[PDB]
Amino acid sequence: GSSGSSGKRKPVIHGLEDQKRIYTDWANHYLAKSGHKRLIRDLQQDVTDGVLLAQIIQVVANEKIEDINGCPKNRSQMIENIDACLNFLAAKGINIQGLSAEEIRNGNLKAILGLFFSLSRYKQQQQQP
Numbered sequence: 104g105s106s107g108s109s110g111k112r113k114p115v116i117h118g119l120e121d122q123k124r125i126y127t128d129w130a131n132h133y134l135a136k137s138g139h140k141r142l143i144r145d146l147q148q149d150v151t152d153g154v155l156l157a158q159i160i161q162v163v164a165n166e167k168i169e170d171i172n173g174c175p176k177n178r179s180q181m182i183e184n185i186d187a188c189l190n191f192l193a194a195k196g197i198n199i200q201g202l203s204a205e206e207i208r209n210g211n212l213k214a215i216l217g218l219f220f221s222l223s224r225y226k227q228q229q230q231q232p
Contacts, residue, residue, distance in 0.1 A: 133163045150215050163222070
C-alpha cells in the first residue's frame with residue numbers, strides 16, 4: 104500500500120530503509136499504469152527473480168527484453184533475469200558498474216536501492232522537442 108497526493112513539502116531525510124519505499128512507489132506507478140493489479144510489497148523481494156523487476160523496466164523504458172528467463176526455477180536461473188536487466192540498462196546509458204545480480208537476488212538493500220537509484224535517472228531529464 105502506497106500513498107500519492109499533493110500536500111506539503113518539507114525537508115526530510117530518507118535513510119536506506121526509507122528509500123526502499125520511495126522507489127517502490129516510483130516503480131509501482133509504471134506497473135499500475137499498465138494495468139498491473141499486483142504491486143511491489145518488498146522492494147528487496149520484488150527484484151529477486153528479475154521478473155517483476157523487468158515488468159517495470161520494459162515499461163518506463165518502453166522496450167522488450169528477450170534476454171529474460173521469464174520462469175525462474177533454479178537459484179542461478181533467477182540470476183540471468185536480473186543480469187539481463189542490468190546489461191539492458193547499461194546500453195541505455197545507465198551506470199550499472201558496482202552492482203551485483205547475486206546481491207540483488209539475495210535482497211541486499213544496498214544493492215536493490217542502487218539499481219532503482221540509477222534506473223530512475225535514465226527517465227529523469229528526458230525532454231524531447
